[PDB]
Design an enzyme around this catalytic site. Structure first.
Site, PDB file in Angstrom:
ATOM      1  N   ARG B   7       0.893  -1.279   0.092  1.00 13.47           N
ATOM      2  CA  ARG B   7      -0.063  -0.198   0.008  1.00 13.47           C
ATOM      3  C   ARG B   7       0.750   1.178   0.068  1.00 13.47           C
ATOM      4  O   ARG B   7       1.357   1.546   0.801  1.00 13.47           O
ATOM      5  CB  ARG B   7      -0.939   0.073   1.103  1.00 13.47           C
ATOM      6  N   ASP B   9       1.236   5.146   0.676  1.00  8.82           N
ATOM      7  CA  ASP B   9       0.602   6.013   1.530  1.00  8.82           C
ATOM      8  C   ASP B   9       1.467   7.148   1.748  1.00  8.82           C
ATOM      9  O   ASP B   9       2.656   6.985   2.121  1.00  8.82           O
ATOM     10  CB  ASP B   9       0.368   5.369   2.975  1.00  8.82           C
ATOM     11  N   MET B  23      -4.754   3.721   9.416  1.00 11.67           N
ATOM     12  CA  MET B  23      -6.336   4.275   9.529  1.00 11.67           C
ATOM     13  C   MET B  23      -7.217   4.775   8.405  1.00 11.67           C
ATOM     14  O   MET B  23      -6.456   5.316   7.888  1.00 11.67           O
ATOM     15  CB  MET B  23      -6.637   5.157  10.897  1.00 11.67           C
ATOM     16  N   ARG B  25     -10.066   7.319   6.988  1.00 12.33           N
ATOM     17  CA  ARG B  25     -10.448   8.655   7.275  1.00 12.33           C
ATOM     18  C   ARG B  25     -11.850   8.528   7.925  1.00 12.33           C
ATOM     19  O   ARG B  25     -11.714   9.257   9.206  1.00 12.33           O
ATOM     20  CB  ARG B  25     -11.015   9.375   6.051  1.00 12.33           C
ATOM     21  N   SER B  49      -7.455   0.507   1.347  1.00 12.95           N
ATOM     22  CA  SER B  49      -7.099  -0.533   0.169  1.00 12.95           C
ATOM     23  C   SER B  49      -5.668  -0.884   0.435  1.00 12.95           C
ATOM     24  O   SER B  49      -4.769  -0.070   0.772  1.00 12.95           O
ATOM     25  CB  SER B  49      -7.373   0.247  -0.766  1.00 12.95           C
ATOM     26  N   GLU B 100      -7.860  -4.750  -5.784  1.00 11.02           N
ATOM     27  CA  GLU B 100      -7.750  -4.524  -4.422  1.00 11.02           C
ATOM     28  C   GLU B 100      -7.900  -5.394  -3.269  1.00 11.02           C
ATOM     29  O   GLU B 100      -8.623  -6.494  -3.385  1.00 11.02           O
ATOM     30  CB  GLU B 100      -8.794  -3.125  -4.363  1.00 11.02           C
TER      31      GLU B 100
END
Ligand code: NA
EC number: 2.4.2.-
Lengths: 103, 216, 103, 103, 103, 103
Positions: B7, B9, B23, B25, B49, B100
């Site tokens: 992922r 990020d 976490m 939103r 995801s 996903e």
């Protein structure tokens, strides 16, 4: 024999209930002689001791004091929501007579 | 098994440790999460995801996190909070090419194997291993099967998926058979998140209490 | 009774408050004879101990030394932030009289 | 008084450090009479025990032996990386005198 | 000294090794008079007990009985894979003498 | 020896099986004199105690009572599903004799 912390607290004069619905913000612990104790706090500033084994405790109250310091330490590290504390309101800071944990 | 997801990020390792993990939103709805618009990588509507491979997640960051000097590709262990989005949403999967796998609730810090750094869209050759990663526990675990997610699909109340296999047999009350469907999808997801988080606290806080020595 | 660690430390002579505000880098315990002790460090090089039980400790302190070694082991393993340590600076490494932990 | 596990181990005869920088692969515990002990291994095959309490130990060590078995269990089940063991090399398997955890 | 559970187990008559390689299915515990004991199961119906401390147990064994109940409770809760149990099959349920845990 | 919790409960008069299959909703503990106990509740309302130690209890029971309170706190913080309690029904609230944990 009481079925909850509120009624148990009420059996003693010199106690009162705080309801926190909040984890413990800080845990403190002393092995210094004559202050063998723990202290906790919360976000709202509220401060509580577990008393040093002193004069006004019996024999089986000495074991439950040790178990209470176990309880608060692991509660602090797990971020356990403390519902209520029944506390001796005549000690400064107030000393923990009981704890309840829900949520 | 010891499988791993991936992922992109923008959030650095220190903030992630501080938040308890990766976490989202709180609305929990897999369909809304999956079709949500994507300046930051899909983390909306109660889920976050990931991708099946390290190369497919790098590519995900190199579109979405274009215009970020530094982002990270977190390597995540598979656990039964993960849902294969194409398996659970079938033909109605909005972005099926992305392959996903969404964590209902987030990815707790124990579940994070580590993270690569990415500067001007180039991958780091090597991995930063996470001191809180749990290899044994999470290697005896797997992604949640599609059957656990069909009832959490989060399709609109009158979507045609709710009157179609496999979803009829998992459809929340009010979904094709007031906001009954919407509230139930939320509550069924809040429960699933609550029971998964219960299970991880079982794992980690039991270890923290393998302290105890009754006799002493 | 003292409200926090800094006030508790101020009661005893030969002590100093170290503010660390960091999880513990290492925990070390020995069961070897005459060295029944713990030793922790931090990323910056600060080393501390829980002393071997001896004639400097009264009997009330004995169970607290064992509690402190429990606390430091589970503090290290949880990656919990230690705010401060109250320590005797007359020993090498400085001996732990008390510990506070805060989020 | 030593500052680390390597220096502690150097104070004793028949001891040696065994650096592992790895979590425990297996934990084995026994309550069989005269085999009340623990045995840990690592992925590389290296094997250590906590001795059965016998005549070789002094009084204060007994508490510490039970502590160390507690440590090995929690280390095993929390998947903590073991840094080093100090061990007596004149038993088979090598017997744990101390442990450090880090990294 | 034995280097594993199988070899430890073979020193004792009327024991046998159970290879389960599975987490404990259920953990039972009793404080009723003359039944202060624990009882685990596995998926496949296999049932085992930590015995009530009695006449078959030496003093060092009573310490380790209390430890096994600690180990077993917390091993149940952690869902740790149990490689093997050395048990006594002159009792029912088969009484645990040793356990080994491994991935 | 009994094979499980239901067998164990059938050995005493004044007992019964309560079948919960839920986590503990609330854990309460008290160190207040002559009320050294725990109390747990479940979301169906059902409330239980671990009795304060007294003259109803034989000596061997002392240890198991301390273990049980530990067990209930661990179970609460881990949210472990409690299958069944064996309880003395001659008390209010029902006093816990044994516990099983499954699933
Ligand atoms: Na996995």
């Amino acid at each position: 024999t009481p079925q909850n912390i509120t009624d148990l607290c009420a059996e003693y004069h010199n106690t009162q209930i705080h309801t926190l619905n909040d984890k413990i913000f800080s845990y403190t612990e002393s092995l210094a002689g004559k202050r063998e104790m723990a202290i906790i706090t919360f976000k709202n500033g509220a401060t509580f001791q577990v008393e040093v084994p002193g004069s006004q405790h019996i024999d089986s109250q000495k074991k439950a004091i040790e178990r209470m310091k176990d309880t608060l330490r692991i509660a602090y590290l797990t971020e356990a929501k403390v519902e209520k504390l029944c506390v001796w309101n005549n000690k400064t800071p107030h000393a923990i007579a009981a704890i309840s944990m829900a949520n | 098994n010891d499988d791993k997801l991936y992922r992109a990020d923008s959030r650095p390792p220190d903030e992630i440790k501080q938040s308890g993990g990766l976490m989202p939103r709180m609305n929990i709805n897999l369909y809304d999460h999956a079709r949500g618009t994507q300046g930051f990588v899909r983390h909306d509507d109660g889920y976050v995801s990931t991708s099946i491979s390290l190369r497919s997640a790098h590519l995900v960051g190199q579109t979405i996190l274009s215009g970020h000097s530094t982002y990270y590709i977190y390597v995540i262990a598979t656990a039964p909070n993960m849902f294969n989005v194409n398996d659970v949403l079938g033909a109605y999967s909005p972005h099926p090419d992305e392959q996903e796998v969404s964590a209902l609730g987030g990815i707790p810090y124990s579940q994070i194997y580590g993270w690569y750094r990415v500067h001007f869209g180039v991958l780091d050759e090597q991995l930063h291993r996470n001191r809180g990663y749990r290899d044994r526990y999470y290697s005896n675990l797997d992604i949640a099967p599609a059957a656990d997610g069909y009832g959490l699909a989060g399709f609109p109340p009158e979507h045609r998926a709710w009157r179609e296999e496999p979803w009829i047999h998992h459809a929340p009350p009010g979904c094709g058979n007031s906001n009954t469907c919407d509230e139930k999808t939320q509550s069924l997801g809040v429960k699933f998140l609550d029971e998964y988080q219960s299970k991880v606290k079982r794992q980690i806080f039991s270890g923290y209490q393998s302290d105890i020595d009754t006799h002493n």
